[model samples]
Target chain A: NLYFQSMLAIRVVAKNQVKPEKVQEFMNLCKSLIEETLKEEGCIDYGVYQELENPEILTMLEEWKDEGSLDQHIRSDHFKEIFPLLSECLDKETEINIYRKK
Target chain B: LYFQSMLAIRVVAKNQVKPEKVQEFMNLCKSLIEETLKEEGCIDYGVYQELENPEILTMLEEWKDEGSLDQHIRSDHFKEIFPLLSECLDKETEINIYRKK
Candidate 1:
């Protein structure tokens, strides 16, 4: 069986400063990416938030079922597709942190 | 009675504790939250950490209204709380506040 009871809930958060001119492009890419991510079996919720004064700063928050599911999702095709477009738009490298609920 | 707006305020407080004092900071915060949650305006308050970095602590809080949030900020508790937090901080804290659209 590919699925088992997820023992630990997962949360992923990352901060990014997107290129100013590519905000729309980033938003467009994010809409689809977020839609796709939430459809994954393990994903619970996903959000992208931005700052008004600091328009370039973006925060990504996500919740998932478990470590196994999160690991698989990270290596999956849809997740891979997000990078090239995002990389070009982001000013700095984004490190993903997966946290277990405390 | 105060006519309520459906407005909710969210505060994201990101703190990085000094490497040597991370444990003591977390312990102090835990106690703070225990009291904070009992306050009238607090809807939710959560504290979390990065998977790889224990020093960076994130507190995501929801308040019933801006008045309540202001109350919390000006409360006697936070007066003392913030000073200790300042000393323990490893870097400038990233504090952001948002309002529901």
Candidate 2:
């Protein structure tokens, strides 16, 4: 059961850098992105946190039941649209990492 | 007797480095990770720098159990490193601990 549980858990960390001038627009889209993402299948947890001292930096912490569900999320319409739009608002390349808890 | 192990302890800390001290802070964290990983019951320890924001550092630690985590926190290495780390930070480090569910 422990092994099975390990296989099913997926964690993602997304680090975003918003253009200084586009902070408001970026946050508005994040609000929509997070709202829609939580309703998707296999989403155990999903939330975005702004760095305390630096409001322009955002980190989205995600937990999913498995890789399949996360892939499905990437294919979802909201993600396909908002993701690129969010990129347009960013000043630098975003960094994302996927991890499986040990 | 057969028994199951308890859930692993995950520690996440967001350390905000003072603008001028980013490199200094990162060097300290690098040392911390290197030493902590060698300690007993440490499954993993990593210090990550935000690509866009160099001043933001996140430390991810996984431990075998609460006892092991406590030991690390109380160790002489931690005691010496933490004070130096705090000096480089602009604000209090935000920390979260989770037990896998």
Candidate 3:
């Protein structure tokens, strides 16, 4: 009966003009974010995936222990702190979606 | 061709209530994926299921670009499978299509 109840899949499509030189910096930030999430109480898994052909598009998948945990996580200090910095590098057209596993 | 990505998640009916129906969906999904793999810009396409919950299926697909993927989605093979999928799903299905940077 234990099934994934909360999963957030965030897909970001970077602006075409975002310089390739900054890709490493962006990836480093993602790595830091994942590391933080991994240490969170309810974070089950978090990872960044880069498309083989489209390096500018990145996908972030995160799974939590439950809805409550996930909700709490979004409000956590780490989230607030990291989000701003991450947003700075984003192209403004990032698309994000949160899903509840049925 | 432009780089593209598509991800989908589906929850199977409980108690294996729709085994045959689920199988049908899988068959179609598999065939269409196989056909797409042959496309010039097709990069990667794969399917996964929850280790604990066999009823949950997830698909991760990537293409050379959004245009290449759109072309396949509008192809006859996709059209044929789309209806079959709609009829077989026991619950809601979520599909996320994206373009690479």
Candidate 4:
């Protein structure tokens, strides 16, 4: 293997297990957050999905144009302000992962 | 095992379901999920529906490696159910694979 490899994209996935009682509240919060996040530069795709087997489990799937874009996203006011509120609605540990396009 | 960490290969399959066939699609996936999890290389396999759109669903999967994922695609169950799943979709499934950086 004597070749160069280039990075293609970045994907972020966060799995949140919402308290059953706060499912609606969590969903409502993400509804607005996702919409606002999409407006940010280099934000390619942003959406919240609920697990089919468990309604209380929601995953935020995001695609960024590049790593720098995501770096900016994390520092953005909207993410900083709303993420903690989102965390408050969760009763269990959240699973957050960042992956590179292969 | 305690000292080693296995970074999984994640696969995301997004399907736009036909409004009339949503129920059938989910039912098909229920069994698929159960069987896939039993496979040796499978780390996790679950389906998620969009909060705003019931017709759009995403199957999120994690495999021990590329080999495991490839085996999954060629497995009997995948071959059997994939087409039926496709028939229920309104559009072609959008699939993407990612690796830890």
Q: Find the candidate with the highest DockQ and give its number.
A: 1
lDDT of each: 0.74, 0.77, 0.56, 0.76
How does each model score on TM-score?
A: 0.78, 0.55, 0.49, 0.52
Scoring model 4 with DockQ, what do you get? Answer: 0.04
For model 3, the superposed segments whose C-alpha errors exceed 4 Å read A3-19, B1-83, B86-101
Candidate 3 lDDT, A1-102, residue by residue in tens: 343232332221122222366667777777777777789877765656554455665666555676577677779787788767766666554554443432
At residue B25, give the lDDT of candidate 3: 67
Candidate 3 reaches a DockQ of: 0.08
Q: Candidate 1 on B36-100: residue-level lDDT in tens?
A: 89899898776777678777787877688778988998887778677777688878788876543
Q: Which pairs of residues clash in candidate 2, taking residues 3 or more apart in a chain or in different chains?
A: none
Better of 2 and 4 by TM-score: 2
Candidate 3 C-alpha lDDT tens digits along B30-51: 8877787787666756454544
The prediction achieving the highest TM-score against the true structure is 1
Worst 10 residues of 2 chain B by lDDT: B1-10
Which pairs of residues collide in candidate 3?
A56-B101, A57-B101, B2-B64, B2-B65, B3-B64, B3-B65
Better model by lDDT, 1 or 4?
A: 4
How does chain A of every candidate compare to the true chain A by TM-score?
A: 0.85, 0.91, 0.74, 0.89
Clashing pairs in 1: none
State the weakest 10-residue window (summed lDDT) of model 4 chain B.
B1-10
Which scores better on TM-score, 1 or 2? 1
